[PDB]
């Protein structure tokens, strides 16, 4: 079925730039959209100003979007649930405030869409995996793709992928998330692991992209970093049991090339400053997602025995004071090799 | 062997920006480098000025690079031959001036490296295929990857792939083209067809990237165009008998993402003007490579029965006056689909 689905209510848990942008997307497909945000005082400000002045400045919220600090009112009556709570707070949220939410989702069979990106430090688990400890996995999908929040929020043409182990679940979500003006287009896939890996690793590679710029390198270098870094996303995906079909799609290469070309982003400027020779302590006086991800990414790579050359060198630069030029020369000391891509056709 | 190879002489046939940049690369690996250019008066100017003032302004040529209008002196003693003659003049060159050159290359077993990109209008053949009508295919390699000429010419870090049916030939060329300071790095592959397809199609997609910008779309759109367009490079590669291992490497995605992000390039500005609604005749008052490639690309796609949605719509906009917004809506009238990538892992 290529016919779109419209709903009475959607709830978005998480009030960041991306969460708000998706609320904008859902406001064209659901009569009512609640965005949950824990601080009551800030919720009131946002509803009065008709604008997420904290994380999406300069964008007018649709009149059918309401911010709320009350979990129970947020999800009550919802026909789709989105999670964009940052990784570190996910488990705590379900433990402290998810009891009724979980019961409701279980009972009503409400589709859940995971948009959180990262790796949990204590378990080295990805967001949809964490959420799957609480909500039955058949209800779980992942959304990932090249999607700057501001472009998504103002309706500028965007393609994403929706991943689900059962393709038919992804296909239902496709009908819900895709807009009537074709401004937001969704492609179905099975590769939830690939999506989640790409989403986490892209942020670490975007620091490297910054390093390259601060070292004096140009766009050829950035293009090579993307291509070689994609192979590390692939190998980690394999080791984690993923089928890998998202790696070379919108969730993998698509989001990765966009994130690494984002010159004004926090990951990039942190990487640029490191490339220019500044120590991380001086840069740290919000944290860049790549900085946070690099340590548990390394720990996970080591546990699975997956070599991630670029990501490892980025970890060394960020966490272990390594000179970026020594890291570059270490990277380039492997000698001449084959590209390392299998043939597609026999 | 990871040890580099150094040579007495290299010859580069073709004096464009890219050809000159590669002469700069070879000047660090060969004692002598000749760059052939047919006009004697312009050859004299370039040698006096120590600068390709016609196609690489502002870059000082290495002292061991000599421009020449004499084919016989150009190749005499060369241990590697590069071709960067534009596609339309390739056959004519061999027919009119290649007789002795071919004999020499055959007799001395001199490696030939194809860097020309495009499709010949009369035969719908790719450059290495044309050259292979004259020089034995075992001597033939293709160079392709993300490589802006100016960045390559001034020694800024660049990775390319070298493709050859016999991987061992690619591996020898790898040792010749890779520089001692690791500023120019080469990766070996077998996928000559994929390289040549990517090289031709990227120029047509870069027009579309322009169209997207002129229509008001943003970076999310560009990222989606790259990803979907890569699938058209893949399908045309399959149909042509290529193994496809370069499609997702430096020659494919790598070069494609760089070319489509090149805002100041001729392909992009032509596409931008078309997106803003200007007719092609008004824009045409040099030709953009994407404009030239689009017609024979379509004819080749039709002959092989390969559907190339984006490329077809770009052809319609360029050649058949089609409104870019009707083309976009036609593209987006296919309904909701799966991403169309096979799993990597079972
Ligand atoms: C962590 C340093 C970041 C600097 C950015 C370098 C620019 C991209 C370099 C890509 C080439 C990587 C070569 C890897 C070789 C290997 O497989 O071990
Ligand atoms: C030729 C028009 C160029 C305008 C650029 C559009 C921006 C990228 C659009 C990518 C989505 C393409 C959808 C193709 C669907 C299909 O497989 O038929
Ligand atoms: Cl404790 C906590 N929980 C959630 Br959900 N989000 C937060 N943001 C800051 N602290 C937070
Ligand atoms: Cl998203 C969108 N934008 C413009 Br401009 N025109 C359209 N027509 C249908 N969907 C459209
Ligand atoms: Cl999504 C979309 N569709 C059409 Br038709 N035209 C556009 N121009 C910008 N975005 C557009
Ligand atoms: Cl006829 C001809 N041959 C070659 Br090689 N290059 C050219 N450039 C313009 N006309 C040309
Ligand atoms: Cl290409 C290159 N550039 C710089 Br800066 N330093 C180097 N050291 C070895 N190769 C190098
Ligand atoms: Cl190629 C290269 N190598 C090293 Br070490 N450092 C650099 N800085 C810029 N390019 C560089």
UniProtKB/Swiss-Prot annotation, chains A, B:
HAMAP family: NAD_Glyc3P_dehydrog. One of its GO terms (molecular function) is NAD binding. It comes from Leishmania mexicana. It catalyses: sn-glycerol 3-phosphate + NAD(+) = dihydroxyacetone phosphate + NADH + H(+). NAD(+) binds at residues 14-19, 89, 117, 149, 266, 287, 289. PANTHER family: GLYCEROL-3-PHOSPHATE DEHYDROGENASE, GLYCEROL-3-PHOSPHATE DEHYDROGENASE [NAD(+)] 2, CHLOROPLASTIC. Changing residue 117 to A/M: Loss of activity. One of its GO terms (cellular component) is glycosome. It is an enzyme of class 1 (oxidoreductase). Belongs to the NAD-dependent glycerol-3-phosphate dehydrogenase family. Its main location: other. The lineage of its organism: Eukaryota, Discoba, Euglenozoa, Kinetoplastea, Metakinetoplastina. The active site is at residue 202. GO terms for biological process: carbohydrate metabolic process; glycerol-3-phosphate catabolic process. PROSITE patterns: NAD_G3PDH. The keyword NAD applies. It is found in: Glycosome. Keywords: Glycosome, NAD, Oxidoreductase, Peroxisome. This is Glycerol-3-phosphate dehydrogenase [NAD(+)], glycosomal. Substrate binds at residues 117, 266-267. InterPro entries: 6-PGluconate_DH-like_C_sf, 6PGD_dom2, G3P_DH_NAD-dep, G3P_DH_NAD-dep_C, G3P_DH_NAD-dep_N, NAD(P)-bd_dom_sf. The keyword Oxidoreductase applies. Its EC number is 1.1.1.8. NCBIfam families: PRK00094.1-2, PRK00094.1-4.
């Amino acid at each position: 079925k290529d016919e779109l689905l419209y709903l009475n209510k959607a709830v978005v848990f998480g009030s960041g730039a991306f969460g708000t942008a998706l609320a904008m997307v859902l406001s064209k497909k659901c009569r009512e959209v609640c965005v949950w945000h824990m601080n009551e005082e800030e919720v009131r400000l946002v509803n009065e100003k008709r604008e997420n002045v904290l994380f999406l400045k300069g964008v007018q919220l649709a009149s059918n979007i309401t911010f709320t600090s009350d979990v129970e009112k947020a999800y009550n009556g919802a026909e789709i649930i989105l999670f964009v709570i940052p990784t570190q707070f996910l488990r705590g949220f379900f433990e402290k405030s998810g009891g009724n939410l979980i019961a409701y989702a279980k009972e009503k069979q409400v589709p859940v869409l995971v948009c959180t990106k990262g790796i949990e430090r204590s378990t080295l688990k990805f967001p949809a995996e964490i959420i799957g400890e609480f909500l039955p996995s058949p209800l779980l999908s992942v959304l990932a793709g090249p999607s700057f929040a501001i472009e998504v929020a103002t309706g500028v043409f965007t393609c994403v992928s929706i991943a689900s182990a059962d393709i038919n679940v992804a296909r239902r979500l496709q009908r819900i998330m895709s807009t009537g003006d074709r401004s937001f287009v969704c492609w179905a896939t099975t590769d939830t692991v690939g999506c989640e890996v790409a989403s986490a690793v892209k942020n670490v590679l975007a620091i490297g992209s910054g390093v390259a710029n601060g070292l004096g390198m140009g766009l050829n270098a950035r293009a090579a970093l993307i291509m070689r870094g994609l192979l590390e996303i692939r190998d980690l995906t394999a080791a984690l049991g993923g089928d890998g079909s998202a790696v070379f799609g919108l969730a993998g290469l698509g989001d990765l090339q966009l994130t690494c070309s984002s010159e004004l982003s926090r990951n990039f400027t942190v990487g640029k400053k490191l490339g220019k020779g500044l120590p991380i302590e001086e840069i740290q006086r919000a944290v860049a997602e790549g900085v946070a991800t690099a340590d548990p990414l390394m720990r996970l790579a080591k546990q699975l025995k997956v070599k991630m050359p670029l990501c490892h060198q980025i970890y060394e630069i960020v966490y272990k004071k390594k000179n970026p030029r020594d890291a570059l020369a270490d990277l380039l000391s492997c000698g001449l090799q084959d590209e390392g891509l299998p043939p597609l056709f026999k």
